[PDB]
Design a protein around this ligand. Structure first.
Ligand SMILES: Nc1ncnc2c1ncn2[C@@H]1O[C@H](COP(=O)(O)OP(=O)(O)OP(=O)(O)O)[C@@H](O)[C@H]1O
Ligand SMILES: Nc1ncnc2c1ncn2[C@@H]1O[C@H](COP(=O)(O)OP(=O)(O)OP(=O)(O)O)[C@@H](O)[C@H]1O
Ligand SMILES: O=C(O)c1cnc2[nH]c(=O)[nH]c(=O)c2c1
Ligand SMILES: [Ca+2]
Ligand SMILES: [Zn+2]
Ligand SMILES: [Zn+2]
Lengths: 694, 146, 49, 48
């Protein structure tokens, strides 16, 4: 593996048909027999593992212990036909035959897979790199054919990305992808967050800003993966372990709890449909359920209790699941503003931003960099902006003692923590806790869950308050959420046009009050008349209430003006009212809402179309790649996969800096400098090397 | 064929065969396919309309019961919101169909202590249900066709 | 796919479609790594026929 | 149509330089290329 790493290092910064790569191919050709022997070793052992996994082999073996005779083992593989006779003999030699000549295929298979994984992966990487950099050579293709099974086995782990290389030339980078990393990426909530992020950037992000947003999303996804790993599960102490198990179970089942709460609200409301009111008990009216069985009243009581309990459990699960992500994002953005921009040092917003003002409390606190990974951001901020405000000013701003960092740098001291409730009591930092509670209470999802719980308690007070929980299914479904968001998408225009409608109706009311008072009587009886325009407020309310709702306008409601001296002015008044208010303004308000709905749906479709048409990383359209069949599909799947970019970032984080290669170190330095020039921008490996490839 | 045999049983069952000309013509086939082109959205928005009408029914049942009498005769009254199921059916049946909303059907609240809340209730019903949600369902069908 | 399982055993499966030798081609393709007899019983062929 | 005219005017300003008429895409090859071109190289405020 070390030798192959040296060869790969020789291949760093190599162009297509490079002289280094050609010498490597010639050297492989000179040692072709030994290379084939190595590849045969790897492929035979991989095939042996798949065969001990194979049903035909399991049928061949008849021992209850699973031990197979050398003769039976031989006939089993020759039944599989993947191995030739000398290969079978060599496998028999490799297997440690006991005195009965019995063979344990499980240990015979897993004995060599673990040691050979690293070297096999490196060999696959080297062969892939050589094949892509020297595409025309037939000897390389032969070597690839022999290593076909190894390449197939390591394909899901082999990650490739292209970076904007150091030499101002596009380079392709090969790296390992962990099985755990891929498994966490395949998680449905991670996929949902990825979809949300993609929609947000493609809708309202510029290309230059989009790399920074993408890197921030990668960091948030890494933290979310850590949260998921922690919450996943394979006398103060026993109480504590039970409590953490309970919290983890709540966090894992948070969406299930939400759905159960929705179902409980539906059942409660269905029960409520049977409610009826009668003056007689089951001059004050009595509310009681009307059912023959009589089970429904206790059923409703238990259902309400269980619904409130489930709402409380949902709040706890949300605190254990999403609040860490919220705090992580806020701490990360605060740290970056503190260090790269010197926000509270240089900028010093004088109540410019409410979030910025709130963030002032946490800077002094010792526990500020807790949730976010960098615990040295305070020290970095000090080293950056100390000189031109002074060490002591930055120290008092960030709540550091200056001698503490020096003594920690000089040596490490470990204090023992007492396992006491009080010892945990002054362990708390009230300023950080207050800032965290403010951040949580400013969160829309937490506020929604709190309103849900409050409405559940109010439902315990009066059962009909449980009807408000039926609104949750609206925000649960994307179409209904878009419907709700449509009314606020054009909210300013809606408010202004409603105001204009009110103004025009007020003018019509003024005209009616001055002249057309007689027609506004709404009482048929001569003895008792009721007048709408005898009072200006009454007539204004009458107009806004009945005229706007009426299809023909106010003239439908008020009395016919036939045979009156004001008849022509009155018909003009009615017709103009019906034209301006019923037709134009109501149509405009309806149009605002409906066009908001349609515009949001078109935004969804446009985001999907843009993803299908352009590569998200390099920005080149699908048409250029599509000249080669499935060209865009391959480009997005292997060459420029954003999942591969995230995997590369995680791999860089886990890997040791001393172990970083040249390209890895270069990308790591750009990443810590927050410079995104390494991302390919309008350029591709196949675009840069198109002539040499062709 | 089954409908033809049922038409032999009763002649009016032959009326169902008139639907065949619809699927025969491309324009009518597109009209039929439009209602299913956005079927999931249609079902969800109809459910949301039912939910909002149910909330309005709950409010009316709790407070505005008196206005819901639909009998002019003093001796024999009939009540829609005396029972929650009855008032829900009354809403979904008459309020949605009415152009002005439920307030057109129910009795005028003039000179009542609940008059302002009731006019707010009627106006919001007419805005949310008659205008927005019905317009959205119509839009789903028509935009599917187009 | 579940419904199509019944027709594989039947002798008349390739009737309507033109290739009457698709069973034999499937056997020659995937016999070795399941065995001749397994593909034969799957497609309802006698091997000697 | 009037509202679409407003949006189209805004979009045209975002897409093309007001002085030279070259689209944003040519400048955008260099990062923030159009922003720099409109801010220093071809600022109509600078022309005034
Ligand atoms: N750089 C990129 N990396 C990955 N995917 C990209 C990139 N640029 C564009 N895409 C598009 O992103 C899409 C995401 O694929 P995915 O399968 O996860 O999506 P989906 O919403 O499940 O639908 P579908 O399977 O129809 O694409 C791909 O279809 C691809 O065309
Ligand atoms: N030659 C040009 N000179 C200046 N601005 C130009 C030119 N060509 C196009 N523009 C565009 O004019 C816009 C005017 O910028 P300004 O900040 O004044 O506008 P705004 O209406 O406040 O909105 P915004 O800040 O979102 O651009 C710029 O965003 C720029 O893209
Ligand atoms: O929390 C972690 O595992 C973690 C540790 N260190 C990190 N370093 C870095 O530069 N970026 C990260 O995203 C990161 C994450
Ligand atoms: Ca090194
Ligand atoms: Zn690309
Ligand atoms: Zn210009």
């Amino acid at each position: 593996k070390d030798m192959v790493v040296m060869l790969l290092s020789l291949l760093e910064g190599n162009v297509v048909n490079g002289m280094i790569a050609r010498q490597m191919v010639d050297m492989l050709v000179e040692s072709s027999s030994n290379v084939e022997m190595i590849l045969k070793f790897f492929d035979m052992f991989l095939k042996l593992k798949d065969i001990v996994g194979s049903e035909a082999f399991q049928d061949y073996v008849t021992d209850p212990r699973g031990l197979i005779s050398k003769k039976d083992f031989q006939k089993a593989m020759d039944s599989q036909k993947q191995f030739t006779g000398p290969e079978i003999q060599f496998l028999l030699s490799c297997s440690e035959a006991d005195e009965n000549e019995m063979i344990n295929f499980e240990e015979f298979a897993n004995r060599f897979q673990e040691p050979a994984r690293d070297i096999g992966f490196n060999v696959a990487v080297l062969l892939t790199n050589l094949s892509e950099h020297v595409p025309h050579d037939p000897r390389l293709r032969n070597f690839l054919e022999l290593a076909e099974s190894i390449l197939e086995y390591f394909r899901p782990y082999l990650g490739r990305i292209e970076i904007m290389g150091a030499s101002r030339r596009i380079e392709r980078i090969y790296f390992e992808i962990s099985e755990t990393n891929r498994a966490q990426w395949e998680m449905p909530q991670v996929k949902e967050s990825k979809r949300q992020f993609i929609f947000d950037v493609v809708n309202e992000g510029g290309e230059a800003e989009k790399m920074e947003l993408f890197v921030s999303f990668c960091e948030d996804t890494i933290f979310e993966m850590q949260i998921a790993a922690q919450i996943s599960e394979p006398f103060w102490g026993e109480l504590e372990v039970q409590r953490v198990k309970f919290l983890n179970y709540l966090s894992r089942n948070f969406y299930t709890l939400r759905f159960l709460a929705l179902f409980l609200a539906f059942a409660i409301n269905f029960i409520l449909l049977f409610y009826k009111v009668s003056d007689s008990p089951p001059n004050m009216v009595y509310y009681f359920l009307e059912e023959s069985t009589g089970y429904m009243e206790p059923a409703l009581w238990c259902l309400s209790l269980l619904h409130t309990l489930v709402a409380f459990l949902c709040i706890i699960g949300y605190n254990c699941l999403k609040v860490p992500l919220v705090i992580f994002k806020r701490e990360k953005e605060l740290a970056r503003k503190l260090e790269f921009d010197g926000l509270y040092i240089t900028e010093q917003p004088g109540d410019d931003d409410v979030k910025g003002q709130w963030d002032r409390l946490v800077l002094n606190t010792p526990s500020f960099p807790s949730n976010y990974w960098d615990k040295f951001v305070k020290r970095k901020v000090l080293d950056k902006h100390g000189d031109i405000f002074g060490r002591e000013r930055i120290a008092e701003l960030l709540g550091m003692d200056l001698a503490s960092l020096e003594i920690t740098a000089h040596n490490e001291r470990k204090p023992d923590p007492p396992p006491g409730l009080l010892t945990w009591l002054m362990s708390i930092d009230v300023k950080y806790q207050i800032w965290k509670f403010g951040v949580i209470f400013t969160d829309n999802s937490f506020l929604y869950l709190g309103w849900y719980m409050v409405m559940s308690l109010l439902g315990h007070y009066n059962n009909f308050f449980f009807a408000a929980h039926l609104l949750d299914i609206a925000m649960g479904v994307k179409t209904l959420r878009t419907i709700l968001s449509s009314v606020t998408h054009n909210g300013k225009q809606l408010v202004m046009t409603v105001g204009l409608l009110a103004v025009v109706v007020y003018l019509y009311t003024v005209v009616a009050f001055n002249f057309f008072r007689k027609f506004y009587n709404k009482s048929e009886d001569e003895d008792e008349p009721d007048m709408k325009c005898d009072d200006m407020m009454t007539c204004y309310l009458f107009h806004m209430y009945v005229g706007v709702r009426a299809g023909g306008g106010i003239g439908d409601e008020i009395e016919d003006p036939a045979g009156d001296e004001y008849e022509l002015y009155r018909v003009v008044f009615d017709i103009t009212f019906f034209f301006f208010v019923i037709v134009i303004l109501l149509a405009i308000i309806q149009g605002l809402i409906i066009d908001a709905f349609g515009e949001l749906r078109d935004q969804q479709e446009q985001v999907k179309e843009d993803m299908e048409t352009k590569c998200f990383i390099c920005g080149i359209g699908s048409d250029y790649f599509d000249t080669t069949p499935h060209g865009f599909e391959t480009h997005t799947l292997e060459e420029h996969n954003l999942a591969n970019y995230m995997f590369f970032l995680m791999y860089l984080i886990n890997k040791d800096e001393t172990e970083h290669t040249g390209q890895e170190s270069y990308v790591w330095k750009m990443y810590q400098e927050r410079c995104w020039d390494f991302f390919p921008a309008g350029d591709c490996f196949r675009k840069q090397y198109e002539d040499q490839l062709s």
